[PDB]
């Protein structure tokens with residue numbers, strides 16, 4: 115049972131919609147970690163308390179090199195604090211902003227690390243559902259770490275998340291209230307893969323409705339520089355029908371992955 119007096123807070127690490135994340139030192143052992151701070155009032159106005167509950171419950175029972183550890187939590191009059199493993203190198207979102215695109219070596223390596231973590235998740239029947247770049251964090255060795263388990267759940271599910279926030283990373287089954295499973299994250303791995311090579315996710319549009327349309331009709335094209343190996347993998351992962359999508363096994367053995375990862 116920890117409290118806020120047990121920590122020294124440093125600078126801010128990020129803003130999510132709900133999370134205000136700060137760097138922290140536990141006073142006792144001098145351990146460096148990150149505190150995700152949530153305001154009771156905004157959770158309660160948005161009615162996302164259940165999401166928090168799932169995040170805490172699911173994320174604490176998971177142990178994997180590529181998954182952000184949740185160490186503990188506690189709360190006070192106005193706030194809830196989650197105690198998290200600190201990720202020194204930022205987010206992939208930021209990496210991507212700095213580089214525009216990633217080469218195949220980097221892309222394929224991130225896809226591997228993702229596939230591993232997902233794999234471990236899925237083996238526990240857990241699905242992330244919110245696998246955007248801003249929730250992919252880098253550890254000290256530049257290894258990728260999955261985070262923000264507020265939208266995670268056990269499979270299968272019907273439950274809506276975002277009323278309409280970013281659809282960019284969501285498969286059709288999801289953007290349409292249908293029962294969906296493990297295959298959801300397979301679709302997102304595809305968006306990510308493509309985004310990583312191109313610098314834009316494949317269904318981006320000026321409006322929500324147009325993106326929605328692009329997504330459900332699976333409308334995307336590749337620019338010229340994208341290699342057949344990549345075209346191939348992205349095409350297998352971005353299938354309308356969830357069950358036509360690869361297994362995590364197949365992705366890792368994919369000739370383009372093995373040719374390019376580390």
Ligand SMILES: Nc1ncnc2c1ncn2[C@@H]1O[C@H](COP(=O)(O)OP(=O)(O)OP(=O)(O)O)[C@@H](O)[C@H]1O
Nearest residue numbers: 127128129130131132133135148199201248262264
């Ligand atoms: N452990 C961490 N180490 C370093 N930076 C972090 C960490 N956690 C979060 N950040 C930074 O803060 C941002 C917001 O955090 P997070 O994604 O957990 O919040 P959220 O998006 O509000 O969560 P949720 O969708 O569950 O409500 C991250 O995208 C990243 O910029």
Ligand SMILES: Cc1c(C(=O)O)cc(-c2ccc(Cl)c(C#N)c2)c2cc[nH]c12
Nearest residue numbers: 154157158163166167170187188189194
């Ligand atoms: C009113 C209130 C209380 C309470 O006073 O009892 C507690 C919480 C809450 C929710 C999740 C976690 Cl994990 C923790 C912790 N630790 C605390 C919340 C959330 C919105 N309102 C709340």
Ligand SMILES: [Mg+2]
Nearest residue numbers: 130248249262
């Ligand atoms: Mg986030």
